């Protein structure tokens with residue numbers, strides 16, 4: 001009585017024996033269990049789901065019910081009392097560039113997406129959710145506390161719809177509810193190529209036999225490509241400025257236009273693919289378009305893996321890196337590659353790294369124009385600021401020369417996200433990412449803070465004094481206890497992010513364990529890991545060792561001055577070097 005999955009919403013895929021290249025869906029990576037890590041399957045559960053009724057109802061759904069004998073605090077109340085702050089001065093990370101934040105979002109999007117329950121034409125219950133703040137079915141509104149300023153301005157709630165789940169879409173099938181991961185669990189550049197064959201096809205340039213991805217036909221960046229537009233309305237990107245009427249971009253991941261620096265990063269990756277495909281055709285004129293595309297794709301996937309494991313993870317996990325992610329020793333087909341449900345909350349540590357402004361810089365790394373520095377909230381689903389206001393180069397220079405926000409126990413999430421989030425269905429710059437994260441936590445039936453501390457072999461504080469000690473902060477611990485009553489009830493997103501950061505890292509002990517375990521698994525459990533014997537040639541592996549994010553920029557923009565270590569904080573001109581001194585990727589090993 002151990003049915004291995006709800007297998008009804010996805011037919012089994014037949015596994016080719018040759019398999020030189022990944023599937024788009026992630027099927028067939030694991031030859032013994034082919035759907036493992038594939039898109040459109042349940043997130044893995046590392047611990048059993050915890051719901052109010054044991055099955056699907058989130059904690060907080062029913063008033064009179066409790067969690068462990070106490071009511072759970074309103075998501076927005078926790079946001080207001082713990083997560084918010086006013087003063088941006090002094091909040092920046094002195095040793096992480098803004099690219100550090102941005103790379104995190106890119107990696108996250110490659111790994112996991114649990115999209116809301118849109119079903120079909122549910123615009124009658126959707127408006128009913130927004131309009132009337134009415135809890136039922138997949139409508140789980142974020143209600144404002146008394147004295148919330150947004151009561152004066154926005155009504156009684158923020159609308160919120162439950163995440164999609166496996167087996168039934170409207171009703172229920174009698175296991176605990178399991179949310180779906182709509183993208184591949186492998187770190188594979190699915191955010192560039194898509195996780196479904198339909199989108200993967202749509203994204204490619206099949207008109208020419210050159211293995212290119214489709215590029216914008218309406219605009220270009222001083223001769224360089226943009227992503228194609230998504231030609232389907234409504235377009236939230238058109239809505240935010242109905243004069244410019246610039247649509248959202250079309251990328252391998254639907255979230256690509258959520259903010260302008262994400263759209264930028266997607267643009268770099270797209271350009272890199274086509275640059276690769278062109279170079280490969282030069283070396284191998286006999287290669288057809290399928291070949292050129294797959295070979296370029298495979299390279300780009302290795303680029304993302306190397307940047308992530310070699311440059312990013314060490315400076316997230318700090319002294320904990322080697323504990324959870326020891327030197328690679330090859331593919332292990334016993335490893336579970338699936339993204340866990342908890343990871344999709346753990347990796348939202350990035351939310352506390354996002355600063356309140358974004359800058360455009362000129363070739364002297366000085367403010368670009370009179371509106372050089374923009375408030376982050378103006379840039380949600382904003383593509384017109386790229387198309388009609390200077391292309392990506394000024395934004396890429398900002399990514400290099402400006403800093404991430406530093407997580408701070410007293411200054412957690414900038415008001416640009418916590419009060420001014422724009423959601424692609426709604427009309428206002430009035431949402432709260434923090435409140436949404438907490439509501440989502442409960443939506444997904446997450447075990448509480450202490451359950452995960454136990455999973456990670458860490459102490460489980462039961463009293464105010466114990467929590468004070470773990471968080472190394474008396475005031476924060478006191479405020480959490482006032483809202484949550486027991487640490488057992490603290491939502492993992494807020495409890496994990498509240499912990500002081502490990503040495504040389506940017507997350508605390510609990511998050512290091514959850515993140516570190518997940519990344520270990522997605523490396524060891526991936527048959528197409530770049531360094532796995534058999535995937536690349538030895539010569540190819542030696543060339544790949546040379547990649548850098550600096551080189552990506554040099555190759556794919558009109559920027560010619562770059563730092564050597566792009567994720568640290570770098571000041572111009574002292575830490576910048578000429579591109580012509582930065583190692584390029586040698587594609588000679590790819591000549592057949």
Ligand code: HEM
Nearest residue numbers: 101104105108112113114259344347348350351354436440
């Ligand atoms: C300006 C920057 C960003 C914005 C506007 C943004 C916005 C969002 C929004 C609206 C969601 C969906 C929330 C929900 O409905 O539950 C989300 C989810 C998420 N964000 Fe961010 N985010 C940003 C930056 C980042 C960064 C820097 C990271 C990581 C380093 C990150 C990691 C995630 C993850 C892992 C999820 C959950 C994805 C899933 O499995 O569905 N985000 N973000």
Ligand SMILES: CC(=O)N[C@@H]1[C@@H](O)[C@H](O)[C@@H](CO)O[C@H]1O
Nearest residue numbers: 241243244370371384387388389
């Ligand atoms: C494409 C376009 O029309 N650009 C205009 C720009 O010329 C003008 O200086 C600015 C005023 O803020 O508004 C922009 O929308």
Ligand SMILES: *[C@@H]1O[C@H](CO)[C@@H](O)[C@H](O)[C@H]1NC(C)=O
Nearest residue numbers: 094095096314315504568569
């Ligand atoms: C900044 O970060 C990098 C990566 O952790 C590290 O090697 C370097 O020594 C750091 N420099 C400072 C300012 O401490």
Ligand SMILES: *[C@@H]1O[C@H](CO)[C@@H](O)[C@H](O)[C@H]1NC(C)=O
Nearest residue numbers: 205207208210212213214215
């Ligand atoms: C496809 O590539 C050809 C060149 O081979 C080019 O003419 C055309 O503009 C490209 N199409 C798209 C949509 O990128």
Ligand SMILES: *[C@@H]1O[C@H](CO)[C@@H](O)[C@H](O)[C@H]1NC(C)=O
Nearest residue numbers: 329331332333334335336524
């Ligand atoms: C591979 O993975 C399994 C399950 O995690 C583990 O028990 C086993 O020891 C691993 N084998 C190697 C060689 O690492």
Ligand SMILES: [Br-]
Nearest residue numbers: 255256258259
């Ligand atoms: Br998003």
Ligand SMILES: [Ca+2]
Nearest residue numbers: 110184186190
């Ligand atoms: Ca992926």
Ligand SMILES: [Cl-]
Nearest residue numbers: 254255258424
């Ligand atoms: Cl989004």
